[PDB]
Amino acid sequence: SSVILTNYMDTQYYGEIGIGTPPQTFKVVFDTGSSNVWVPSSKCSRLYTACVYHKLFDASDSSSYKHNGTELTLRYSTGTVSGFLSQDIITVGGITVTQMFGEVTEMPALPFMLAEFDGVVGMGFIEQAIGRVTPIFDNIISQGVLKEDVFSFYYNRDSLGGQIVLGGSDPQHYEGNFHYINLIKTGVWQIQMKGVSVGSSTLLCEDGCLALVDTGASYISGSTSSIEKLMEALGAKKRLFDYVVKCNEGPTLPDISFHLGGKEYTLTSADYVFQESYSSKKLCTLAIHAMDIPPPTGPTWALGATFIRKFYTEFDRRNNRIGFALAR
């Protein structure tokens, strides 16, 4: 089964799901870096800006809704956000499942209030599900209709916007052969990166740092120290919320590579700077940024949309691995 995705300025890739009877539709991101299903609830007080311009879920218009109401909580660097657990039929790419999701009653506004999509679908493992709730993909496996205990991602360059494939891969969007990397500590789609490189000066992640293959992440992230180092060491200036470089001097910034289980994944200037134009006047942003991630998971890096745009990604639960292939 394939889920068509939409790309909002190469920074947000979402899809559509259906909750309830009749199907209440939600625009959502499929995040391999989280494990629950979250949708803005209708019972979400309007006092939260995140609950004013996004589809809300009304249990009141669903014949299939089942009440549980367990309070869920998750603090996210601007943390807070909470709600309760509800059950109901969700539909993804044709498939139907009786899933447990959270209805957001409280939300820290940002970043959400800027989301062109409404909710998030956790593609992560059951080991990290709030309330220890069975993840959606897990439930889909239970039905035994798929072909492979796997699912692949494809983020496009923007302006088809993207595509997720449940239970398989799609050859139309990648070339070459998948080179796999085993998961460090299964329970997380995290792999053992072996050094980041800025081309000549392979100074970074020397030894053995970690890396998250986060589809729900738009940029590539690393500790604040790491990013600072990598940043200026590119001619990249630091701003209020993202590094940049005069637009006209972007096309000649070094290449970035990630030594991942046997191969060198390289991103070029084109892959990491939004070349709004080539003016020698205006500034241009880099699809990279600080972001400090807390343990036990981190501080690991985060290979998000920037990476995925270039390398088609497959997550294979069957063998706790992850493949990468030149995206086409």
Ligand X SMILES: COC(=O)Cn1ccc2ccc(OC[C@H]3CNCC(=O)N3c3ccc(OCCCOCc4ccccc4OC)cc3)cc21
Size, binding site for ligand X by CB under 6 A: 28
Q: Quote the least distance from Cβ 185 to ligand X, whole Å.
A: 17
Backbone angles phi, psi at 2, to 5 degrees: -120, 135
216-245 residues in contact with ligand X (CB under 6 A) are 216-218
Q: Is 314 a residue that touches ligand X (CB under 6 A)?
A: no
- Least distance (Å) from ligand X to the CB of residue 144? 28
Binds ligand X (CB under 6 A): choice among 214, 260, 289, 303: 214
**Amino acid at the residue 100:** M
CA proximity to 199, closest of 137, 252, 131, 277: 252
Q: Per CB under 6 A, does 120 bind ligand X?
A: yes
- Using alpha carbons, list the distances in angstroms from residue 193 to 154, 184, 204, 221, 320: 21, 10, 11, 13, 16
**Residue of 54, 289, 309, 317 interacting with ligand X (CB under 6 A):** 54
Binding status of residue 286 toward ligand X by CB under 6 A:
no
Please pick, from the candidates 30, 38, 57, 189, the single residue that binds ligand X as defined by CB under 6 A: 38
Among 31, 88, 138, 314, binds ligand X (CB under 6 A): 31
The maximal CA–CA distance of the chain, rounded, in angstroms, is 61
Q: CB of 88 within 8 A of CB of 65?
A: yes
118 binds ligand X (CB under 6 A): yes
Smallest separation, CB 28 to ligand X (Å): 7
Dist. CA 40–CA 310, nearest whole Å: 31
Strands 162-166 and 2-8: antiparallel
Q: Collapsing DSSP states into helix, strand and coil, what is residue 91?
A: strand
- Interface residues with ligand X (CB under 6 A) are 11-13, 29, 31, 33-34, 38, 40, 50, 54, 76, 81, 104, 107, 111-112, 115, 117-120, 214, 216-218, 304-305
